[PDB]
Amino acid sequence: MKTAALFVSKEFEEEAIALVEGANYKVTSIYKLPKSPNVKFYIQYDKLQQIKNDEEISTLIIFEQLKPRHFINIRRELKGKEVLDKILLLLEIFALHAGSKEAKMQIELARLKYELPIIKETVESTIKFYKRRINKLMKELESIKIFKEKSIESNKRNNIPSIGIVGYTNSGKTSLFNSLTGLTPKRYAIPINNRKIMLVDTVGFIRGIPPQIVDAFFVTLSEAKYSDALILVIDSTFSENLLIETLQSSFEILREIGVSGKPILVTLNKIDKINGDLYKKLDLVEKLSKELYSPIFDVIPISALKRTNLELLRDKIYQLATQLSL
Ligand SMILES: Nc1nc2c(ncn2[C@@H]2O[C@H](COP(=O)(O)OP(=O)(O)O)[C@@H](O)[C@H]2O)c(=O)[nH]1
Numbered sequence: 431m432k433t434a435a436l437f438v439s440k441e442f443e444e445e446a447i448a449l450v451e452g453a454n455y456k457v458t459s460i461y462k463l464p465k466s467p468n469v470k471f472y473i474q475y476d477k478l479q480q481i482k483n484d485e486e487i488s489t490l491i492i493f494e495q496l497k498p499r500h501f502i503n504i505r506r507e508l509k510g511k512e513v514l515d516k517i518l519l520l521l522e523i524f525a526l527h528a529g530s531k532e533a534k535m536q537i538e539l540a541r542l543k544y545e546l547p548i549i550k551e552t553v554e555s556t557i558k559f560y561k562r563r564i565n566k567l568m569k570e571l572e573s574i575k576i577f578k579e580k581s582i583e584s585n586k587r588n589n590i591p592s593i594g595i596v597g598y599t600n601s602g603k604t605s606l607f608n609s610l611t612g613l614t615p616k617r618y619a620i621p622i623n624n625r626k627i628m629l630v631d632t633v634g635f636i637r638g639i640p641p642q643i644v645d646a647f648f649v650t651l652s653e654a655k656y657s658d659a660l661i662l663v664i665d666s667t668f669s670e671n672l673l674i675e676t677l678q679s680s681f682e683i684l685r686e687i688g689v690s691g692k693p694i695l696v697t698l699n700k701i702d703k704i705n706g707d708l709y710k711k712l713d714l715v716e717k718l719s720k721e722l723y724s725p726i727f728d729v730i731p732i733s734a735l736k737r738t739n740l741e742l743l744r745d746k747i748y749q750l751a752t753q754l755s756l
């Protein structure tokens with residue numbers, strides 16, 4: 431519920447908002463980055479000050495990658511209030527979604543490795559500790575990896591079919607999970623007809639993921655593979671070219687994280703932003719999906735926001751669930 435001040439470029443503004451709300455922050459104020467970052471505080475001094483003194487702000491979030499000296503300084507000027515850069519932001523998101531100890535360990539590891547430098551710039555006892563913890567985590571992860579190869583695909587069952595909602599950020603993953611579970615988190619079981627179905631708002635596909643935290647991301651996302659079905663959300667407001675990119679990228683990642691032979695209901699979302707190109711885009715998405723993956727359960731136009739084609743969606747989801755109930 432924490433309130434946040436977002437600093438971002440116009441280019442990635444709608445990107446950051448979606449991600450910040452993903453991280454359970456209320457974006458109370460946004461600020462455009464200044465092109466040339468402050469040598470001390472990265473952002474603007476005056477703007478940093480207003481934030482220092484605005485009691486309505488628990489957290490300062492900067493959708494860029496700050497260097498150690500930036501954190502050091504911004505932290506000084508913001509005693510008590512937390513500052514997140516892009517790395518820490520995504521990491522907080524992963525934490526909100528990671529259920530597996532392995533994924534949790536990847537996140538801890540990366541956070542430690544991200545603090546290590548900030549602390550190293552400047553205590554020895556702390557450094558020594560970070561080192562010892564980083565090593566322990568790697569050994570833990572290393573032994574999990576070994577366990578996996580020396581074990582068989584267990585993959586427990588579930589009382590209720592669980593359907594993970596996947597897709598790029600700002601595609602509408604959350605909006606859809608919300609309208610489907612009539613809320614306003616993470617996992618929720620909903621009754622469609624005489625059958626109950628577990629829904630999961632999954633961690634999305636994420637653009638420009640920094641090297642530091644790719645492992646954390648991959649493992650977090652891979653948890654989706656233990657779903658019975660997946661609803662792939664897609665932003666209909668993309669031009670055909672970008673639309674092709676998204677589809678290509680989506681199924682690339684899905685094959686990457688080991689999704690196979692899993693029914694996928696593709697939803698083309700945001701159709702209330704009508705440009706007159708529905709049919710065109712809908713046929714494009716459907717053809718290309720078929721070409722890239724199987725089994726494609728169905729491809730359907732929707733508006734998570736306006737709830738325009740909700741009944742049919744619930745029908746497809748029901749039919750899908752019924753299909754998986756045996
Ligand atoms: N017009 C329209 N906007 C939508 C729709 N679904 C989501 N949005 C908006 O798109 C932005 C991203 O939504 P979000 O659920 O956070 O996307 P996510 O990052 O994939 O989970 C939000 O600000 C929504 O209000 C839709 O069906 N129609």
Ligand SMILES: [Mg+2]
Pocket residue numbers: 448451452603604634
């Ligand atoms: Mg989200």
